Design a protein around this ligand. Structure first.
Ligand SMILES: *[C@@H]1O[C@H](CO)[C@@H](O[C@@H]2O[C@H](CO)[C@@H](O[C@@H]3O[C@H](CO)[C@@H](O)[C@H](O[C@H]4O[C@H](CO)[C@@H](O)[C@H](O)[C@@H]4O[C@H]4O[C@H](CO)[C@@H](O)[C@H](O)[C@@H]4O)[C@@H]3O)[C@H](O)[C@H]2NC(C)=O)[C@H](O)[C@H]1NC(C)=O
Ligand SMILES: *[C@@H]1O[C@H](CO)[C@@H](O[C@@H]2O[C@H](CO)[C@@H](O[C@@H]3O[C@H](CO)[C@@H](O)[C@H](O)[C@@H]3O)[C@H](O)[C@H]2NC(C)=O)[C@H](O)[C@H]1NC(C)=O
Ligand SMILES: *[C@@H]1O[C@H](CO)[C@@H](O[C@@H]2O[C@H](CO)[C@@H](O[C@@H]3O[C@H](CO)[C@@H](O)[C@H](O)[C@@H]3O)[C@H](O)[C@H]2NC(C)=O)[C@H](O)[C@H]1NC(C)=O
Ligand SMILES: *[C@@H]1O[C@H](CO)[C@@H](O[C@@H]2O[C@H](CO)[C@@H](O)[C@H](O)[C@H]2NC(C)=O)[C@H](O)[C@H]1NC(C)=O
Ligand SMILES: *[C@@H]1O[C@H](CO)[C@@H](O[C@@H]2O[C@H](CO)[C@@H](O)[C@H](O)[C@H]2NC(C)=O)[C@H](O)[C@H]1NC(C)=O
Ligand SMILES: *[C@@H]1O[C@H](CO)[C@@H](O[C@@H]2O[C@H](CO)[C@@H](O)[C@H](O)[C@H]2NC(C)=O)[C@H](O)[C@H]1NC(C)=O
Ligand SMILES: *[C@@H]1O[C@H](CO)[C@@H](O[C@@H]2O[C@H](CO)[C@@H](O)[C@H](O)[C@H]2NC(C)=O)[C@H](O)[C@H]1NC(C)=O
Ligand SMILES: *[C@@H]1O[C@H](CO)[C@@H](O[C@@H]2O[C@H](CO)[C@@H](O)[C@H](O)[C@H]2NC(C)=O)[C@H](O)[C@H]1NC(C)=O
Ligand SMILES: *[C@@H]1O[C@H](CO)[C@@H](O[C@@H]2O[C@H](CO)[C@@H](O)[C@H](O)[C@H]2NC(C)=O)[C@H](O)[C@H]1NC(C)=O
Ligand SMILES: CC(=O)N[C@@H]1[C@@H](O)[C@@H](O)[C@@H](CO)O[C@@H]1O
Ligand SMILES: *[C@@H]1O[C@H](CO)[C@@H](O)[C@H](O)[C@H]1NC(C)=O
Ligand SMILES: *[C@@H]1O[C@H](CO)[C@@H](O)[C@H](O)[C@H]1NC(C)=O
Ligand SMILES: *[C@@H]1O[C@H](CO)[C@@H](O)[C@H](O)[C@H]1NC(C)=O
Ligand SMILES: *[C@@H]1O[C@H](CO)[C@@H](O)[C@H](O)[C@H]1NC(C)=O
Ligand SMILES: *[C@@H]1O[C@H](CO)[C@@H](O)[C@H](O)[C@H]1NC(C)=O
Ligand SMILES: *[C@@H]1O[C@H](CO)[C@@H](O)[C@H](O)[C@H]1NC(C)=O
Ligand SMILES: *[C@@H]1O[C@H](CO)[C@@H](O)[C@H](O)[C@H]1NC(C)=O
Lengths: 398, 313, 176
């Protein structure tokens, strides 16, 4: 068990610290769930009595895209995927050194393809909310402003000892399970008009999504009689790598109608035109989430086609497809997985955020706004969660 | 620089802890079944029509036994009229839709179930003739033979009537198949309810008849040997019963094993991969039985082709 | 900035420089600020341009510090300058594509006049500097025409173009 002591009163000079934090999640330590196994060997139980000391008159410049704390979580989830889904073939590139003598030719074609073969057991998979807690001597601040602007200074700074519920869910084009906005859908981006930094859009209302596969692959009709030998029962008849989702159109249309109102105020009365993405990797062109080793690659072309104009006011069939050979977001290379499993898999998920890029240009005339879906950089996935916090070290006179 | 991951091929198989590559065994069987089934249909059609011509006009169906022999040949014809369809079903697929599939499936089992039913009636008629000779004479009226047969056909229809509950055919797998889709909500009940009905009515019941009836008949053989023709008449009915058992009881045993691959029997997939080559052979052996009963009549029967037995030797 | 040359159809290599060695985010934009390629974690995003099914990048070199730009099927209209974007910097590059062909395929008789057809991009000043096996280093403007073409003047002539101290070689199909 762990234990830390408070600070009754301290307002000294603040200095940005880069110390090593310890996780703290509510595990179980008995099930065969992987996140319960990982939290048992490296995490501690959650704080039963948290304390948030509110600072009356205190301000600070919370820069968020230069936060070194999200660089630690990104190196703590890569340590979980090497203990959760062991790939059958882990093909990764490996080059060494080839240069000539910038002034001399830079033809580097020496690269080795190292392959690793491991056992592939299909294991359970479900995220668990964790709490990152500060070590001895440091403190974690937290704004309470309902807008917070991204890298802008707030005024309602309060200090804590552990963060809120953070799930390690890995997804693209739609931020899954996590925290919601307070009062209004806000947008966050490091620099607008940059047409390079992704725009994080956080929602204030949870849009639900149900992603399941129908159990009709195996046949239940019996040809009891002349056949019953070749076409015998339990024979696969359907595609075992096909699924479908559904989105409540009457509820999702409200939340998207609030996103375009924020853009109009920000970008001075333009024609918001959403579009499908411009191509690339199948983890970028399509949606990508995980449910028990089932890596749903959901076609979202019937989700971002619609163009917009002013005066704005049921079951969208989202076609998904399970692909075995997937790209690893952790560095370069691929990872071939195992065949899918026997039974109904249901992903009764949430939608809390939205990752959007921007297509600006000067060849195109004065007014257009193209917002293609982006994401894929998993550091940007948890910058949408660790935006309120900051690790600062306060020296003690004692 | 040279990565070897480029393969679009996939396998239609679930993930288990024992990979079992089960071979379809349809093509090898499709080059053996359509000529065999056609040969069965050739010999069976001209075989049974002769047994219908001879009894109707040469013998005169003057007795209850001849009536059951007629109906047994008719039961074989109901089996025979479906044989060219199954001949053209291993070879390619099911081209006949489904509206006719609720009739053809029924006609298959009407041929099957009534087939053993009249053989049992043949056994009981000969049993009554030997032991209860006073009782048999009162009840072996040809009139009573007809009304017994009419009931026997009705029961044979009802014995296939659960199979006619659903015969819907949809494209599952390579080509449309007509696999009965009985209700899912009580799925475990109906599946076990079908293995027993073939085994009890087709194997257990005629075995129980054979034990009871041929113990009373063999008692006559222990007493005296005065009448050869009484002993020779039992040889016809006895042969029909055992040739039915030689050709159908291997299927009945395997059919129990087909459903019971659980703790009751054997659980290995390789045990079910030899069993995949066992069910079709014993079903094929059963298919050949419909032409054997006229062949028996030309060898055992000393009333139909008795002059051919002297002419052959 | 440096300049390279294209040969009307082949591939070209346009590299950037990065000394951080952390696989940081890169981008690829033209003078009109249009995205073509870009880093997304460890993934590749083909940006919305007219070079969607043409632009390529070597992912194995991303953990080194060199980010190439492989564009296949080089056309004349693709001549534009491209800037890099690593560690908040703008490594400006330049790109020029051109071509040269004839009009008479096989009917080049002995004593028949020769015609050329230079396909140079607008906004550039090329200079035809050919080389013949008979020692004819004929130099001129952009369009070159020779009255003499016989059996002894066949073969793949090496016509190169000098512009900004850069030159690439070509061949000429002559059938006599
Ligand atoms: C976002 O948050 C939501 C919560 O609101 C998440 O939704 C939950 O997701 C989990 C993960 O799938 C899901 O848990 C499953 O529930 C099923 C129904 O209760 C269970 O049957 C299932 O257990 C089976 O599957 C496990 C993994 O395959 C096995 O380890 C387990 O032993 C069970 O296995 C049996 O069934 C399988 C079927 O294939 C078979 O192979 C086995 O042999 C065995 O017979 C899971 O526990 C929750 O139910 C979801 N919550 C709700 C309310 O539905 C959502 O997933 C989050 N988003 C993301 C991306 O994770
Ligand atoms: C600055 O941040 C602090 C963070 O604590 C804010 O204090 C919190 O204010 C909310 C209301 O805005 C309080 O919620 C209310 O609490 C009461 C009593 O618990 C409850 O009955 C209400 O239903 C409601 O939930 C919250 O308790 C309070 N936090 C604490 C620790 O007391 C403060 O309001 C912020 N100031 C500004 C100007 O935004
Ligand atoms: C049982 O499994 C099958 C497939 O394994 C599922 O069928 C699929 O259903 C969807 C919609 O219900 C079909 O999409 C539609 O296809 C038609 C024809 O191409 C098109 O015109 C429509 O616009 C729509 O896209 C899909 O084609 C179909 N798949 C097949 C192979 O037929 C079925 O949904 C599963 N059962 C249940 C209860 O879910
Ligand atoms: C929200 O953030 C933006 C930029 O991220 C801030 O805009 C700048 O604000 C400073 C002073 O605060 C000005 O000097 C700059 O000229 C502004 N730049 C632009 C492009 O507007 C904005 O002030 C922030 N809002 C709050 C309330 O802090
Ligand atoms: C966001 O990016 C833009 C470039 O798109 C930056 O604007 C440049 O600012 C410098 C100095 O202020 C000027 O010299 C350039 O001419 C500007 N470029 C353009 C296209 O206007 C802007 O400063 C960036 N903002 C932040 C906060 O980084
Ligand atoms: C997801 O959407 C599909 C498409 O409407 C739903 O499928 C229908 O389900 C109803 C049952 O409520 C059936 O009566 C329809 O025949 C189905 N349509 C088709 C085309 O098959 C599906 O039920 C939805 N799933 C959820 C969980 O809402
Ligand atoms: C996705 O699934 C959830 C839960 O299975 C559905 O949520 C329920 O929806 C019914 C009516 O559809 C409501 O009466 C319940 O109160 C809801 N429960 C919860 C916990 O939300 C949801 O409707 C499904 N979405 C779609 C589009 O089918
Ligand atoms: C995801 O769905 C979209 C939209 O249905 C698919 O896009 C289509 O692209 C094909 C081929 O270019 C066109 O023939 C269709 O007209 C497009 N859709 C429509 C309705 O216009 C896209 O192909 C799907 N994803 C994949 C990978 O198949
Ligand atoms: C997904 O969205 C639903 C929307 O209803 C969430 O359900 C509510 O969540 C709040 C927050 O904890 C609870 O106080 C409510 O009691 C929940 N409602 C019901 C009917 O249970 C749900 O929690 C969201 N999922 C996650 C993981 O946050
Ligand atoms: C999914 C699939 O088809 N897998 C195969 C894999 O077995 C191996 O042969 C590979 C070559 O490197 O090609 C691919
Ligand atoms: C904080 O600012 C408020 C202004 O409303 C003031 O009343 C209060 O005294 C300040 N707190 C301290 C500790 O000075
Ligand atoms: C290539 O990779 C293999 C496997 O990791 C290794 O044994 C070998 O030494 C490598 N060769 C070079 C030249 O790096
Ligand atoms: C742009 O929108 C603002 C909203 O406050 C409005 O005041 C302004 O007049 C609009 N400008 C144009 C050109 O429509
Ligand atoms: C998007 O919708 C429009 C009609 O609103 C349609 O013309 C267009 O084809 C759709 N996009 C795609 C990619 O099909
Ligand atoms: C916005 O709405 C007004 C009337 O509500 C209309 O006159 C105007 O044309 C609309 N704007 C655009 C760009 O269509
Ligand atoms: C969705 O929003 C658009 C915005 O103009 C509106 O026209 C449409 O009617 C809305 N659909 C539903 C089902 O509310
Ligand atoms: C865009 O703005 C420029 C300068 O204000 C103007 O010359 C041009 O005509 C505008 N474009 C259109 C389509 O009106």
């Amino acid at each position: 068990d762990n234990l830390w002591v408070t600070v009754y009163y301290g307002v000294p000079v603040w200095k940005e610290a880069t110390t090593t934090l310890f996780c703290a999640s509510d595990a179980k330590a008995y099930k065969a769930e992987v996140h319960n196994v990982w939290a048992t060997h490296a995490c501690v139980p959650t704080d039963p009595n948290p304390q948030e000391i509110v600072l009356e008159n205190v301000t600070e410049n919370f820069n968020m895209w230069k936060n070194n704390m999200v660089e630690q979580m990104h190196e703590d989830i890569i340590s979980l995927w090497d203990q959760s889904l062991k790939p059958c073939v882990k093909l990764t590139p490996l080059c060494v050194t080839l240069n000539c003598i910038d002034n001399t030719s830079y033809r580097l074609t020496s690269c080795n393809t190292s392959v690793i073969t491991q056992a592939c057991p299909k294991v359970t998979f479900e995220p668990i909310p964790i709490h990152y807690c500060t070590p001895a001597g440091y403190a974690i601040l937290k704004c309470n402003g309902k807008k917070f602007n991204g890298t802008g200074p707030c005024t309602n700074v309060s200090t804590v000892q552990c963060t809120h519920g953070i799930k390690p869910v890995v997804s693209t084009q739609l931020l899954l399970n996590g925290s919601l906005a307070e009062e209004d859908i806000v947008i966050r981006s490091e620099n607008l008009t940059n047409n390079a930094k992704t725009i994080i859009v956080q929602l204030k209302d949870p849009v639900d999504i149900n992603c399941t596969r129908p159990n009709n692959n195996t046949r239940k009709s019996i040809h009891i009689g002349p056949g019953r030998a070749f076409y015998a029962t339990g024979d696969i008849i359907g595609d075992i790598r096909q699924a479908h989702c559904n989105l409540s159109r009457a509820q999702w249309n409200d939340t998207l109608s609030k996103i375009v109102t924020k853009l109009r105020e920000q970008f001075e009365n333009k024609t918001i035109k959403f579009q499908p993405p411009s191509g690339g990797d199948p983890e970028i062109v399509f949606h990508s989430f995980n449910c028990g080793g089932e890596f749903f690659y959901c076609n979202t072309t019937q989700l971002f086609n619609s163009t917009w104009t002013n005066n704005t006011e049921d079951t969208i069939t989202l076609p998904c497809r399970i692909k075995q050979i997937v790209n690893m977001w952790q560095e370069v290379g691929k990872a071939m997985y195992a065949p899918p499993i026997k039974g109904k898999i249901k992903c009764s998920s949430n939608i809390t955020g939205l990752l959007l890029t921007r297509d600006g240009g000067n060849n195109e005339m004065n007014t257009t706004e193209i917002f293609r879906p982006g994401g894929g950089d998993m550091r940007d996935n948890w910058r949408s969660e660790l935006y309120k916090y900051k690790v600062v070290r306060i020296e003690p006179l004692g | 620089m040279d990565y070897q991951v480029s393969s679009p091929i996939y396998d239609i198989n679930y993930y288990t802890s024992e990979p079992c590559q089960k071979i379809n065994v349809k093509q090898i069987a499709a080059r053996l079944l359509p000529p065999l089934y056609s040969l069965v249909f050739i010999f069976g059609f001209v075989g049974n029509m002769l047994v219908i011509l001879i009894l109707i006009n040469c013998k005169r169906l003057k007795s209850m036994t001849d009536i059951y022999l007629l109906n047994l040949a008719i039961s074989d014809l109901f089996f025979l009229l479906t044989v060219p369809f199954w001949a053209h079903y291993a070879a390619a697929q099911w081209d006949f839709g489904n509206t006719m599939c609720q009739l053809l499936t029924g006609l298959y089992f009407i041929g099957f179930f009534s087939g053993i039913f009249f053989i049992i009636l043949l056994t009981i008629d000969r049993y009554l003739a030997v032991v209860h000779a006073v009782f048999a004479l009162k009840a072996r009226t040809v009139t009573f033979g007809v009304v017994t047969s009419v009931i026997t056909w009705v029961v044979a229809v009802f014995a296939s009537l659960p199979g006619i509950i659903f015969t819907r055919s949809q494209k599952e797998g390579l080509h449309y198949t007509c696999s009965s889709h009985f209700p899912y909500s009580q799925y475990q009940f109906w599946k076990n309810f079908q293995t027993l009905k073939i085994v009890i009515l087709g194997l257990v019941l005629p075995l129980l008849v054979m034990v009871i009836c041929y113990s009373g008949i063999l008692k006559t053989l222990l007493r005296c040997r005065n009448e050869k023709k009484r002993h020779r008449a039992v040889r016809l009915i006895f042969t029909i019963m055992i040739v039915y058992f030689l050709f159908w009881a291997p299927y009945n045993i395997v059919l129990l094993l087909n459903t019971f691959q659980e703790f009751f029997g054997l659980n290995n997939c390789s045990s079910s991969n030899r069993l995949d080559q066992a069910m079709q052979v014993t079903e094929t052996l059963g298919m050949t039985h419909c032409c054997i009963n006229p062949i028996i009549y030309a060898f055992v029967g000393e009333k139909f082709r008795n002059y051919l037995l002297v002419f052959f030797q | 900035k440096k300049v390279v040359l294209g040969k009307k159809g082949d591939t070209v290599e346009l590299t950037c420089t990065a000394s951080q060695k952390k696989s940081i985010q890169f981008h690829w934009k033209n003078s009109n600020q249009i995205k073509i390629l870009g880093n997304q974690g460890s993934f590749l995003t083909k940006g919305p341009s007219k070079l969607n099914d043409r632009a390529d990048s070597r992912r194995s070199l991303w953990d080194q510090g060199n980010f190439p730009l492989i564009i296949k099927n080089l056309k004349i209209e693709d001549s534009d300058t491209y800037i890099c974007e690593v560690e908040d910097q703008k490594e400006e590059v330049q790109l020029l594509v051109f071509g040269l062909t004839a009009n008479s395929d096989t009917h080049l008789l002995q004593g028949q006049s020769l015609t050329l057809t230079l396909e140079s991009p607008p906004g550039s000043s090329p200079s035809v500097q050919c080389r013949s096996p008979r020692g004819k280093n004929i130099q001129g403007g952009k369009t070159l025409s020779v009255s003499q073409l016989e059996l002894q003047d066949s073969g793949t002539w090496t016509c190169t173009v000098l512009q900004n101290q850069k030159k690439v070689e070509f061949k000429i199909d002559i059938v006599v």
